[PDB]
Every structure is written in C-alpha cells, then in structure tokens.
Short mmCIF file of N, CA, C and O and ligand atoms in Angstrom, two decimals:
data_model
loop_
_atom_site.label_atom_id
_atom_site.label_comp_id
_atom_site.label_asym_id
_atom_site.label_seq_id
_atom_site.Cartn_x
_atom_site.Cartn_y
_atom_site.Cartn_z
N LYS A 249 -34.90 1.28 40.52
CA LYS A 249 -33.98 0.33 40.22
C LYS A 249 -33.40 0.12 39.07
O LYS A 249 -34.49 -0.12 38.49
N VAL A 250 -32.24 0.64 38.81
CA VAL A 250 -32.47 0.77 37.18
C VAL A 250 -30.89 -1.15 37.73
O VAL A 250 -29.86 -0.41 37.90
N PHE A 251 -31.51 -1.80 36.79
CA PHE A 251 -30.32 -3.14 36.89
C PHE A 251 -29.29 -2.97 36.24
O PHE A 251 -29.40 -1.81 34.77
N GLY A 252 -28.14 -3.91 36.35
CA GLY A 252 -27.48 -4.19 35.83
C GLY A 252 -28.26 -5.31 35.08
O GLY A 252 -29.02 -6.08 35.42
N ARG A 253 -27.70 -5.78 33.59
CA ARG A 253 -27.80 -6.76 32.79
C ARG A 253 -27.49 -8.17 33.55
O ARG A 253 -28.55 -8.56 33.11
N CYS A 254 -26.79 -8.34 34.08
CA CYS A 254 -26.14 -9.49 34.28
C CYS A 254 -26.84 -10.03 35.74
O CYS A 254 -27.22 -10.65 35.83
N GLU A 255 -26.39 -8.30 36.42
CA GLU A 255 -28.08 -8.18 38.12
C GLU A 255 -29.18 -8.63 37.39
O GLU A 255 -30.31 -9.29 38.35
N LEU A 256 -29.93 -8.21 36.74
CA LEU A 256 -31.12 -8.89 35.55
C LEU A 256 -31.88 -10.39 34.95
O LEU A 256 -32.65 -10.62 36.01
N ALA A 257 -30.17 -10.20 34.67
CA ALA A 257 -30.46 -11.74 33.56
C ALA A 257 -30.12 -12.73 35.49
O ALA A 257 -30.96 -13.75 35.41
N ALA A 258 -30.17 -12.52 36.16
CA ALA A 258 -29.89 -13.18 37.98
C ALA A 258 -30.86 -13.36 39.05
O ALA A 258 -31.19 -14.47 38.59
N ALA A 259 -31.33 -12.72 38.61
CA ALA A 259 -32.78 -12.32 39.73
C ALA A 259 -33.63 -13.67 38.09
O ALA A 259 -34.45 -13.17 39.34
N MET A 260 -34.03 -12.68 37.41
CA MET A 260 -34.72 -13.94 36.43
C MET A 260 -34.82 -15.00 36.42
O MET A 260 -36.28 -15.58 36.64
N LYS A 261 -33.54 -15.43 36.78
CA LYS A 261 -32.97 -16.58 36.25
C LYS A 261 -33.24 -17.54 38.52
O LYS A 261 -34.77 -18.38 37.55
N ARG A 262 -33.30 -16.98 39.17
CA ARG A 262 -33.88 -17.06 40.66
C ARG A 262 -36.07 -17.49 40.55
O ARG A 262 -36.05 -17.96 41.14
N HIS A 263 -36.10 -16.10 39.56
CA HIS A 263 -38.01 -16.11 39.77
C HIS A 263 -38.78 -17.16 38.64
O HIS A 263 -39.38 -16.87 38.38
N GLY A 264 -37.43 -17.84 38.16
CA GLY A 264 -37.37 -19.12 36.74
C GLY A 264 -38.77 -18.95 35.73
O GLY A 264 -38.88 -19.12 35.07
N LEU A 265 -38.39 -17.52 34.98
CA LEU A 265 -38.25 -17.18 33.60
C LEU A 265 -37.49 -17.61 32.42
O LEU A 265 -37.67 -17.36 31.38
N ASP A 266 -36.04 -18.60 33.29
CA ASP A 266 -35.79 -18.83 31.83
C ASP A 266 -36.52 -20.61 31.66
O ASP A 266 -36.14 -20.82 32.87
N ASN A 267 -36.48 -19.87 30.46
CA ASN A 267 -37.52 -21.26 30.00
C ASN A 267 -38.15 -21.33 30.15
O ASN A 267 -38.96 -22.20 29.20
N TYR A 268 -38.86 -20.44 30.21
CA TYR A 268 -39.99 -20.44 31.29
C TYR A 268 -40.98 -20.88 30.27
O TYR A 268 -41.10 -19.77 28.85
N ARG A 269 -41.72 -21.50 29.20
CA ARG A 269 -43.08 -21.53 28.41
C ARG A 269 -41.96 -21.69 26.52
O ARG A 269 -42.12 -20.95 26.55
N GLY A 270 -40.95 -22.46 27.34
CA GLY A 270 -40.18 -21.97 25.85
C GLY A 270 -39.41 -21.07 25.56
O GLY A 270 -38.54 -21.41 24.75
N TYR A 271 -39.11 -20.12 26.98
CA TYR A 271 -38.37 -18.91 26.68
C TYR A 271 -37.35 -18.45 27.27
O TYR A 271 -37.28 -18.85 28.02
N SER A 272 -36.01 -18.81 26.87
CA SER A 272 -35.46 -18.91 26.97
C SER A 272 -34.26 -17.78 27.76
O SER A 272 -34.79 -16.55 27.87
N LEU A 273 -33.66 -17.58 28.90
CA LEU A 273 -33.43 -16.44 29.70
C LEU A 273 -33.14 -15.06 28.77
O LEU A 273 -33.54 -13.73 29.02
N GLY A 274 -31.83 -15.06 27.46
CA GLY A 274 -32.13 -13.56 26.63
C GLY A 274 -33.40 -13.05 26.40
O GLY A 274 -32.89 -12.24 26.32
N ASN A 275 -33.82 -13.50 25.75
CA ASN A 275 -34.89 -13.84 25.76
C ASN A 275 -35.66 -12.53 26.56
O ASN A 275 -35.86 -10.62 26.75
N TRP A 276 -35.92 -12.72 28.15
CA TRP A 276 -36.47 -11.92 28.82
C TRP A 276 -35.27 -10.16 29.23
O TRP A 276 -35.93 -9.81 29.42
N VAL A 277 -34.73 -10.27 28.79
CA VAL A 277 -33.57 -9.50 29.55
C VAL A 277 -33.47 -8.61 28.42
O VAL A 277 -33.39 -7.47 28.29
N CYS A 278 -33.49 -9.75 27.25
CA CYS A 278 -33.75 -8.53 25.63
C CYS A 278 -35.15 -7.98 26.02
O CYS A 278 -35.40 -6.24 25.11
N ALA A 279 -35.78 -8.65 26.30
CA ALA A 279 -37.18 -7.56 26.41
C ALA A 279 -37.54 -6.86 27.36
O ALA A 279 -37.66 -5.23 27.50
N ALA A 280 -35.74 -6.97 28.50
CA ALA A 280 -36.78 -6.04 29.67
C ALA A 280 -35.55 -4.09 29.38
O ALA A 280 -36.13 -3.33 29.30
N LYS A 281 -34.50 -5.23 28.21
CA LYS A 281 -34.04 -3.64 27.99
C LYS A 281 -34.70 -2.79 26.62
O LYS A 281 -34.56 -1.45 27.31
N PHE A 282 -34.86 -3.11 26.09
CA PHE A 282 -35.67 -2.40 24.80
C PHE A 282 -37.41 -1.37 25.72
O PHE A 282 -37.73 -0.75 25.45
N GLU A 283 -37.75 -2.50 26.90
CA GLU A 283 -38.40 -2.39 27.08
C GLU A 283 -37.97 -0.89 28.15
O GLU A 283 -39.52 0.01 28.22
N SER A 284 -37.83 -0.93 28.57
CA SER A 284 -37.63 -0.57 30.04
C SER A 284 -36.63 -0.07 31.07
O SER A 284 -35.91 0.94 30.87
N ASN A 285 -35.68 -0.02 29.30
CA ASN A 285 -33.62 0.07 29.95
C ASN A 285 -33.45 -0.75 31.46
O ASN A 285 -32.37 0.85 31.46
N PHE A 286 -33.72 -1.97 31.71
CA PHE A 286 -33.68 -2.31 32.94
C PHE A 286 -33.93 -1.02 34.12
O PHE A 286 -34.36 -1.52 35.27
N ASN A 287 -35.19 0.25 34.07
CA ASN A 287 -35.33 0.89 35.26
C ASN A 287 -37.02 0.37 35.28
O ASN A 287 -37.62 0.70 34.96
N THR A 288 -36.95 -0.15 37.05
CA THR A 288 -37.88 -0.52 37.85
C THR A 288 -39.24 1.06 37.21
O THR A 288 -40.29 0.26 37.70
N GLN A 289 -38.52 1.77 37.53
CA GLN A 289 -39.47 2.73 37.32
C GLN A 289 -40.85 3.64 36.53
O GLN A 289 -40.88 3.83 36.15
N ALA A 290 -39.95 2.04 35.44
CA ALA A 290 -40.63 3.63 33.81
C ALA A 290 -41.94 3.13 33.41
O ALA A 290 -42.59 2.43 33.82
N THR A 291 -42.59 4.41 33.83
CA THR A 291 -44.08 3.83 32.32
C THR A 291 -43.68 5.17 31.13
O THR A 291 -43.43 5.61 31.38
N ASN A 292 -44.70 4.95 30.90
CA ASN A 292 -45.05 4.96 29.40
C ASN A 292 -46.92 5.39 29.50
O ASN A 292 -47.17 3.97 29.51
N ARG A 293 -47.78 6.35 28.54
CA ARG A 293 -48.72 6.96 28.60
C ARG A 293 -49.85 5.62 27.13
O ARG A 293 -48.65 5.96 26.38
N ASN A 294 -50.33 4.66 26.83
CA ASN A 294 -50.49 5.41 25.48
C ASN A 294 -51.51 5.90 25.08
O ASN A 294 -52.18 6.48 26.42
N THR A 295 -51.63 5.97 23.80
CA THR A 295 -53.08 6.44 23.02
C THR A 295 -53.97 6.21 23.36
O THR A 295 -55.24 7.05 24.13
N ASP A 296 -54.21 5.18 24.53
CA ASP A 296 -55.59 4.56 24.50
C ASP A 296 -56.33 4.70 25.87
O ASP A 296 -57.12 5.17 26.52
N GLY A 297 -55.10 6.46 26.56
CA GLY A 297 -55.57 6.16 27.52
C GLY A 297 -54.37 5.82 28.95
O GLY A 297 -54.42 5.78 30.34
N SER A 298 -54.09 3.98 28.56
CA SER A 298 -53.62 3.02 29.43
C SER A 298 -52.25 3.52 29.60
O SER A 298 -52.42 4.27 29.71
N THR A 299 -51.77 3.17 30.24
CA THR A 299 -49.55 3.20 31.04
C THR A 299 -49.87 1.76 31.38
O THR A 299 -49.66 0.84 31.58
N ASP A 300 -48.23 1.81 30.44
CA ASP A 300 -47.74 0.65 30.61
C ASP A 300 -46.46 0.87 32.39
O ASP A 300 -45.93 2.61 31.73
N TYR A 301 -46.23 0.28 33.36
CA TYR A 301 -45.53 -0.29 33.70
C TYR A 301 -44.11 -1.06 34.08
O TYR A 301 -44.71 -2.52 34.30
N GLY A 302 -43.46 -0.30 34.98
CA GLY A 302 -41.88 -1.31 35.35
C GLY A 302 -41.64 -1.56 34.33
O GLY A 302 -41.14 -1.57 33.23
N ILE A 303 -40.26 -2.69 34.88
CA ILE A 303 -39.27 -3.62 33.91
C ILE A 303 -39.58 -3.87 32.83
O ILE A 303 -38.75 -4.22 31.58
N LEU A 304 -40.94 -4.52 32.55
CA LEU A 304 -41.84 -5.15 31.47
C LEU A 304 -43.22 -4.93 30.92
O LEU A 304 -43.28 -5.17 30.43
N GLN A 305 -42.78 -3.42 31.21
CA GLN A 305 -43.77 -2.18 31.11
C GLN A 305 -45.75 -2.73 30.44
O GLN A 305 -45.38 -3.24 29.79
N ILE A 306 -45.32 -3.25 32.27
CA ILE A 306 -47.21 -3.92 31.45
C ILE A 306 -48.39 -3.30 31.82
O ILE A 306 -47.97 -2.45 32.31
N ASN A 307 -49.49 -3.53 31.13
CA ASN A 307 -50.01 -2.56 30.20
C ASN A 307 -50.99 -2.69 31.36
O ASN A 307 -52.06 -3.52 32.02
N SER A 308 -52.12 -1.62 31.36
CA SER A 308 -53.28 -1.15 33.05
C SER A 308 -53.86 -1.28 32.40
O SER A 308 -55.29 -1.96 32.89
N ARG A 309 -54.43 -2.12 30.27
CA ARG A 309 -55.59 -2.36 29.75
C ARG A 309 -56.04 -3.59 30.22
O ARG A 309 -57.44 -3.90 30.52
N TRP A 310 -55.54 -4.70 30.66
CA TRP A 310 -55.28 -5.65 31.21
C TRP A 310 -54.97 -6.47 32.33
O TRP A 310 -55.73 -7.37 32.95
N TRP A 311 -53.97 -5.30 32.63
CA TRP A 311 -53.40 -6.75 33.70
C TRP A 311 -53.00 -6.39 35.48
O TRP A 311 -53.07 -7.06 35.54
N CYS A 312 -53.45 -4.36 35.39
CA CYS A 312 -53.13 -3.92 36.42
C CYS A 312 -53.59 -3.02 36.62
O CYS A 312 -54.62 -2.35 35.86
N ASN A 313 -54.34 -2.68 38.16
CA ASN A 313 -55.42 -1.87 38.26
C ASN A 313 -55.05 -0.45 38.42
O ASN A 313 -53.37 -0.19 40.03
N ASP A 314 -55.31 0.25 37.61
CA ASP A 314 -54.14 2.09 38.00
C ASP A 314 -54.96 3.11 38.56
O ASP A 314 -55.71 4.28 39.02
N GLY A 315 -56.76 2.87 38.71
CA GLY A 315 -57.50 3.76 38.73
C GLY A 315 -57.99 4.87 37.83
O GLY A 315 -58.80 5.35 38.45
N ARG A 316 -57.24 4.05 36.97
CA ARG A 316 -57.49 5.57 35.54
C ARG A 316 -57.57 5.38 34.63
O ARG A 316 -57.42 6.16 33.25
N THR A 317 -57.48 3.63 33.98
CA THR A 317 -57.94 2.78 33.11
C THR A 317 -59.29 2.65 32.60
O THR A 317 -59.72 1.43 32.85
N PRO A 318 -60.43 3.47 32.66
CA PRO A 318 -61.95 2.86 32.90
C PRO A 318 -62.15 1.51 31.56
O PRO A 318 -61.87 1.88 30.84
N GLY A 319 -62.74 1.07 32.34
CA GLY A 319 -63.81 -0.83 31.56
C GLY A 319 -62.19 -1.76 30.99
O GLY A 319 -62.54 -2.41 30.49
N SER A 320 -60.90 -1.02 32.17
CA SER A 320 -60.28 -1.92 31.27
C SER A 320 -60.23 -3.55 32.57
O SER A 320 -60.40 -3.28 33.98
N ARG A 321 -59.24 -4.41 32.74
CA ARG A 321 -58.66 -4.85 33.53
C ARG A 321 -58.07 -5.43 34.15
O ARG A 321 -56.60 -4.22 33.78
N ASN A 322 -57.95 -6.07 35.16
CA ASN A 322 -56.84 -6.17 35.65
C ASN A 322 -56.98 -8.28 37.51
O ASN A 322 -56.75 -8.38 37.20
N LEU A 323 -55.57 -8.04 35.54
CA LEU A 323 -56.09 -9.91 35.45
C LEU A 323 -54.57 -10.59 35.74
O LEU A 323 -54.71 -11.45 36.39
N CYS A 324 -53.63 -9.59 36.16
CA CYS A 324 -53.08 -9.77 37.73
C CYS A 324 -53.37 -9.14 38.87
O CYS A 324 -52.74 -10.25 39.67
N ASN A 325 -54.59 -8.84 39.18
CA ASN A 325 -55.01 -8.91 40.58
C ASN A 325 -53.65 -7.68 41.40
O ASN A 325 -53.42 -8.32 42.32
N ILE A 326 -53.28 -7.34 40.65
CA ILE A 326 -52.30 -6.10 41.51
C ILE A 326 -52.00 -4.79 40.76
O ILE A 326 -53.26 -4.70 40.31
N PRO A 327 -52.12 -4.01 42.08
CA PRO A 327 -51.95 -2.14 41.31
C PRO A 327 -50.69 -1.67 40.37
O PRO A 327 -49.74 -3.01 40.92
N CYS A 328 -51.43 -1.50 39.57
CA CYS A 328 -49.91 -1.91 39.12
C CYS A 328 -48.35 -1.22 39.96
O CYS A 328 -47.64 -0.86 38.58
N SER A 329 -49.42 0.26 40.70
CA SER A 329 -47.89 0.53 41.38
C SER A 329 -46.55 -0.22 42.21
O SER A 329 -45.67 -0.37 41.55
N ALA A 330 -47.74 -2.01 41.67
CA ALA A 330 -46.45 -2.71 42.94
C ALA A 330 -45.19 -3.44 41.98
O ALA A 330 -44.69 -4.08 41.95
N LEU A 331 -45.69 -2.79 40.44
CA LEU A 331 -44.68 -3.37 39.16
C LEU A 331 -43.73 -2.50 38.79
O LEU A 331 -42.98 -2.20 38.12
N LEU A 332 -43.21 -1.31 40.45
CA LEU A 332 -42.81 0.08 39.87
C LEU A 332 -41.25 -0.54 41.27
O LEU A 332 -39.80 -0.42 41.58
N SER A 333 -41.53 -1.84 42.34
CA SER A 333 -41.21 -2.27 43.15
C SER A 333 -39.41 -1.80 42.73
O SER A 333 -39.28 -3.43 41.68
N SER A 334 -38.22 -1.79 43.66
CA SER A 334 -37.36 -2.82 43.17
C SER A 334 -37.22 -3.85 42.94
O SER A 334 -36.11 -4.56 42.80
N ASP A 335 -38.11 -5.09 44.06
CA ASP A 335 -38.13 -6.15 43.87
C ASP A 335 -39.15 -6.51 42.48
O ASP A 335 -39.80 -5.89 42.33
N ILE A 336 -38.31 -7.65 42.00
CA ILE A 336 -38.97 -7.36 40.55
C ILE A 336 -40.29 -8.83 40.53
O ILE A 336 -40.65 -8.75 40.00
N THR A 337 -40.75 -9.67 42.21
CA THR A 337 -41.05 -10.36 41.66
C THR A 337 -42.52 -10.65 40.98
O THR A 337 -43.47 -11.01 40.40
N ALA A 338 -42.70 -8.68 41.64
CA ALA A 338 -43.88 -8.99 41.79
C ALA A 338 -44.82 -8.41 39.61
O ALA A 338 -45.37 -9.11 38.12
N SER A 339 -43.82 -8.06 38.86
CA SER A 339 -43.73 -8.17 37.53
C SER A 339 -43.43 -9.46 36.85
O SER A 339 -43.58 -10.17 35.13
N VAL A 340 -42.64 -10.86 37.36
CA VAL A 340 -42.54 -11.74 36.28
C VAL A 340 -43.27 -11.88 37.17
O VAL A 340 -43.53 -13.08 36.42
N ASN A 341 -43.72 -12.34 38.12
CA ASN A 341 -45.22 -13.29 38.03
C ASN A 341 -46.62 -12.96 37.33
O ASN A 341 -47.07 -14.21 36.38
N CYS A 342 -46.78 -11.47 37.09
CA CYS A 342 -47.35 -10.92 36.39
C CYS A 342 -47.19 -11.49 34.22
O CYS A 342 -47.75 -12.01 33.92
N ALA A 343 -45.77 -10.61 34.46
CA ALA A 343 -45.16 -11.78 33.51
C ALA A 343 -45.57 -12.94 32.84
O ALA A 343 -45.73 -13.47 31.70
N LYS A 344 -45.17 -13.69 33.58
CA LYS A 344 -45.25 -15.76 33.40
C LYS A 344 -47.15 -15.61 33.30
O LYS A 344 -47.13 -16.43 32.71
N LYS A 345 -47.90 -14.47 33.79
CA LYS A 345 -49.37 -14.87 33.32
C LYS A 345 -49.86 -14.09 31.79
O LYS A 345 -50.24 -15.10 30.89
N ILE A 346 -48.95 -13.38 31.90
CA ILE A 346 -48.94 -13.13 29.56
C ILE A 346 -48.48 -13.88 29.27
O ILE A 346 -48.84 -13.82 27.60
N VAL A 347 -47.51 -14.13 28.91
CA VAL A 347 -46.86 -14.73 28.22
C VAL A 347 -47.66 -16.95 28.03
O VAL A 347 -47.54 -16.91 27.64
N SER A 348 -48.13 -16.77 28.79
CA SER A 348 -48.66 -17.85 28.73
C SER A 348 -50.55 -18.06 28.31
O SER A 348 -51.11 -18.75 28.36
N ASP A 349 -50.48 -16.91 27.82
CA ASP A 349 -52.27 -16.26 27.08
C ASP A 349 -52.43 -16.55 26.60
O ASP A 349 -53.67 -16.44 25.17
N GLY A 350 -51.05 -16.59 25.57
CA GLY A 350 -51.77 -17.89 24.27
C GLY A 350 -50.73 -17.10 22.97
O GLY A 350 -50.13 -17.90 21.65
N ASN A 351 -50.00 -15.70 23.26
CA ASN A 351 -49.51 -15.19 22.48
C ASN A 351 -47.88 -15.29 22.41
O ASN A 351 -47.19 -15.00 22.04
N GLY A 352 -47.22 -16.44 23.73
CA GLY A 352 -45.83 -16.04 23.80
C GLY A 352 -45.44 -14.32 24.67
O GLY A 352 -46.21 -13.31 24.81
N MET A 353 -44.24 -14.19 24.46
CA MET A 353 -43.87 -12.93 24.18
C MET A 353 -43.64 -12.03 23.26
O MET A 353 -44.35 -10.85 23.17
N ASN A 354 -44.44 -12.16 21.40
CA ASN A 354 -45.72 -11.10 21.44
C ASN A 354 -46.14 -10.17 21.94
O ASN A 354 -46.46 -8.75 21.29
N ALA A 355 -46.64 -10.17 23.33
CA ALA A 355 -47.33 -9.36 24.50
C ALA A 355 -46.59 -8.06 24.41
O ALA A 355 -47.20 -7.14 24.65
N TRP A 356 -44.67 -8.80 23.90
CA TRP A 356 -44.34 -7.07 24.62
C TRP A 356 -44.02 -6.94 22.86
O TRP A 356 -43.28 -7.23 22.41
N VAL A 357 -44.66 -5.82 22.19
CA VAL A 357 -43.55 -5.12 20.92
C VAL A 357 -42.53 -4.73 21.08
O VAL A 357 -41.58 -5.94 19.70
N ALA A 358 -40.87 -4.07 21.55
CA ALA A 358 -39.88 -4.39 21.96
C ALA A 358 -39.08 -5.39 21.32
O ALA A 358 -38.49 -5.58 20.75
N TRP A 359 -39.64 -6.75 22.06
CA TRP A 359 -39.54 -7.63 21.44
C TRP A 359 -39.48 -8.40 20.66
O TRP A 359 -39.11 -8.78 19.32
N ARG A 360 -40.77 -8.00 20.20
CA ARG A 360 -41.19 -8.68 18.99
C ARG A 360 -40.22 -8.04 18.20
O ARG A 360 -39.61 -8.66 16.84
N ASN A 361 -40.43 -6.36 18.07
CA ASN A 361 -39.37 -6.09 16.62
C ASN A 361 -37.68 -6.11 17.31
O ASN A 361 -37.17 -5.96 16.69
N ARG A 362 -37.09 -6.14 18.09
CA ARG A 362 -36.36 -6.31 18.22
C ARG A 362 -35.17 -7.28 19.14
O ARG A 362 -33.74 -7.07 19.37
N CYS A 363 -35.67 -8.01 19.97
CA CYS A 363 -35.87 -9.20 19.90
C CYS A 363 -35.25 -10.20 19.43
O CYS A 363 -34.64 -11.06 18.96
N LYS A 364 -36.94 -10.94 19.51
CA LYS A 364 -37.62 -11.91 18.04
C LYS A 364 -36.25 -12.50 16.82
O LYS A 364 -36.34 -11.33 16.67
N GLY A 365 -36.09 -13.73 16.92
CA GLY A 365 -35.09 -13.22 15.64
C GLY A 365 -33.26 -13.05 15.88
O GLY A 365 -32.67 -13.03 14.78
N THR A 366 -33.00 -12.50 16.57
CA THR A 366 -31.56 -11.86 17.12
C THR A 366 -31.58 -13.16 17.80
O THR A 366 -32.30 -14.28 18.35
N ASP A 367 -29.36 -12.74 18.32
CA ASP A 367 -29.64 -13.92 18.99
C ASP A 367 -29.41 -13.40 20.68
O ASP A 367 -28.58 -12.46 21.00
N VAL A 368 -30.43 -13.79 21.37
CA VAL A 368 -30.73 -13.75 22.34
C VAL A 368 -29.64 -13.69 23.63
O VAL A 368 -29.39 -13.28 25.17
N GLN A 369 -29.07 -14.46 23.27
CA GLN A 369 -27.90 -14.89 24.12
C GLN A 369 -27.20 -14.68 24.50
O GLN A 369 -26.58 -14.38 25.34
N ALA A 370 -26.52 -13.75 23.70
CA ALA A 370 -25.92 -12.39 23.80
C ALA A 370 -26.11 -11.74 24.16
O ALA A 370 -25.49 -11.42 25.65
N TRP A 371 -26.84 -11.66 25.53
CA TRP A 371 -27.55 -10.35 26.59
C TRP A 371 -27.12 -10.94 27.73
O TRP A 371 -27.27 -10.25 28.71
N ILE A 372 -27.31 -12.40 27.50
CA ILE A 372 -26.53 -13.48 29.30
C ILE A 372 -24.90 -13.66 29.02
O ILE A 372 -25.15 -14.24 29.87
N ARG A 373 -24.45 -13.17 27.59
CA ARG A 373 -23.02 -13.66 27.93
C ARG A 373 -22.22 -12.45 28.87
O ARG A 373 -22.50 -11.86 29.09
N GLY A 374 -21.40 -14.33 29.24
CA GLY A 374 -20.09 -13.18 30.60
C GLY A 374 -20.82 -12.64 31.57
O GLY A 374 -20.39 -13.27 32.96
N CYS A 375 -22.29 -13.81 32.12
CA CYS A 375 -23.12 -13.14 33.22
C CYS A 375 -22.67 -14.96 34.12
O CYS A 375 -22.64 -15.36 33.49
N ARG A 376 -22.61 -14.53 35.03
CA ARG A 376 -22.54 -15.72 36.82
C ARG A 376 -23.82 -15.56 36.86
O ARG A 376 -24.07 -14.74 37.44
N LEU A 377 -24.43 -16.78 37.04
CA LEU A 377 -25.83 -17.52 37.19
C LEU A 377 -25.74 -18.77 37.30
O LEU A 377 -26.78 -19.21 37.66
CL1 CL B 546 -30.75 -16.80 26.47
CL1 CL B 547 -58.59 1.77 35.79
CL1 CL B 548 -35.53 -8.83 42.16
CL1 CL B 549 -44.75 -19.59 22.58
NA1 NA B 550 -56.59 -2.65 34.45
#
C-alpha cells in the first residue's frame, strides 16, 4: 500500500508514535517519506547481504528474520515479510523497539540526513488528526 501523507500521519498517531521517546509525529512521517516513499512494500538490499523492509526500512541484520541473512538477529521476533503488510502495526511495534535502543531515530539514515534539524511539523501540516 502507498499511503497518503495525512493518512499515514493518522495511522501512526493512533498506533502511539506521536511524541514516542520524544519524537513528534512529523519526524516519523518524514522518515517514512524518505525511507520508503510511503510504500509498505519497499525493499532494498544492503552491501552486507541484509535487506531493509517496509515503510520504515527495518533491517534484517538485527530486527527481523528473512531466512537469508546469516548470523543476524531477529530482535523484533517477526518475519521480515510482516513489515510489508498494508497494516503498519508490525512496523510500528518494531520501530518502537529500535528507537528505544539508545540511538533514537539516528538508526534511520534518511531521518538523520534529511529530517533531523528541519521543520518536521511541515509533514503533518493540514492533516486532520
Ligand atoms: Cl511534528
Ligand atoms: Cl537469517
Ligand atoms: Cl495501519
Ligand atoms: Cl533520543
Ligand atoms: Na535477521
């Protein structure tokens, strides 16, 4: 599913991401835009052989099991394919574990490079939440 900006903002808000670990909703919408272009089916393969999955591009090296990343962890205890669902619950629940692990949203390279330090409130402007 390819979300609309305000549609995804509302879905993330109802799943508890607004101000989660101090990150306002615009940060999460901005990260999703640049990680996946709002597409739950996005996948991208990394140089180490791991793959990133879903709207928040969660990495199989640490967070999910895809059966082809040897020696990797599955810290969210989910198959990576569950992160590609039109229902963002599994991606949100895993993202909450990632953002809580000490490095905040810096785990998302596109957030660090394209959202951090910008007016992220602009990503939720006009939306009915
Ligand atoms: Cl915001
Ligand atoms: Cl594996
Ligand atoms: Cl959803
Ligand atoms: Cl933080
Ligand atoms: Na894994």
